[PDB]
């Protein structure tokens, strides 16, 4: 009979890269969460989760810090995800209707 | 403004 590895079928989205800070707007919240919600709500209907995290990556790469007079002014951040997924992960929202 | 987590 087929057995499993100790761990599989996980996907982990990180707000930033190893060694670095993730950025948060004191009013609007975290860049990564803001991007994640905008993409998932827009594209979960027709895009798998790993591909949506790629769209999140695109949004984070483009953003820059607004924090005049401080070391965060114009700073950058890059998100990433690590995957042990073994199939497309579609959330099929609102199906069946 | 933007700050670090």
């Amino acid at each position: 009979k087929m057995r499993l590895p100790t761990r599989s079928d996980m996907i982990c989205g990180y707000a930033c890269l190893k060694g670095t800070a993730a950025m948060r707007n004191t009013k609007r919240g975290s860049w990564y969460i803001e991007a994640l919600a905008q993409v998932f709500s827009e594209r979960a209907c027709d895009m798998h989760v790993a591909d949506m995290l790629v769209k999140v990556n695109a949004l984070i790469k483009d953003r820059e810090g607004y924090a005049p007079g401080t070391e965060f002014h114009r700073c950058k951040e890059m998100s990433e995800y690590c995957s042990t997924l073994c199939r497309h992960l579609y959330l099929f929202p609102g199906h069946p209707p | 403004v933007d700050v670090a987590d």
Partner: protein
């Protein structure tokens, strides 16, 4: 915030090459937000918007949402484990865990300024420890720093 539904046609043409994802609820989701510290850890201003945004998003994606706020390292471990052991997981198709706090590479802070290792978190939901989720997609979203280095950015040539 509104989530556009998938069409019947998109389902029909994609379900065979995707994880099974049709249970109602789609899974349980856990949103664990740490905003108030003291134990070099600044108040996570705007952390409240993240928490509310994720709770709304996961509900609209068809998840049953559990929320935890301002928890110590030990409380996070115990409650993550309690969540992972819930009976619902056998009849759902997927799981979501979102962790929002300060942190360092590979670990996140409880409000007591102590660390919970992400390896231990993932282990709670693995094939040996969480058999009810075997072969089911498990999503983790980690909003936390992984070091104190600010990325100053670089010019594009």
């Amino acid at each position: 915030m509104q989530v556009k539904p998938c069409t019947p046609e998109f389902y029909q043409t994609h379900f065979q090459l995707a994880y099974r994802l049709q249970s109602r609820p789609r899974g349980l989701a856990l949103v664990l937000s740490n905003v108030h510290f003291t134990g070099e850890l600044e108040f996570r201003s705007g952390g409240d918007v993240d928490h509310s945004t994720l709770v709304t998003l996961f509900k609209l994606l068809g998840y049953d949402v559990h929320v935890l706020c301002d928890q110590t390292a030990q409380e996070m471990q115990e409650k993550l484990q309690n969540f992972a052991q819930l009976p619902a997981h056998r009849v759902t198709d997927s799981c979501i865990v979102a962790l929002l706090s300060h942190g360092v590479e590979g670990a996140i802070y409880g409000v007591d300024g102590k660390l919970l290792q992400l390896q231990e978190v993932f282990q709670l939901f693995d094939n040996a420890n969480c058999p009810s989720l075997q072969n089911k997609p498990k999503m983790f979203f980690i909003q936390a720093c992984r070091g104190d280095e600010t990325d100053r950015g670089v010019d594009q040539q």
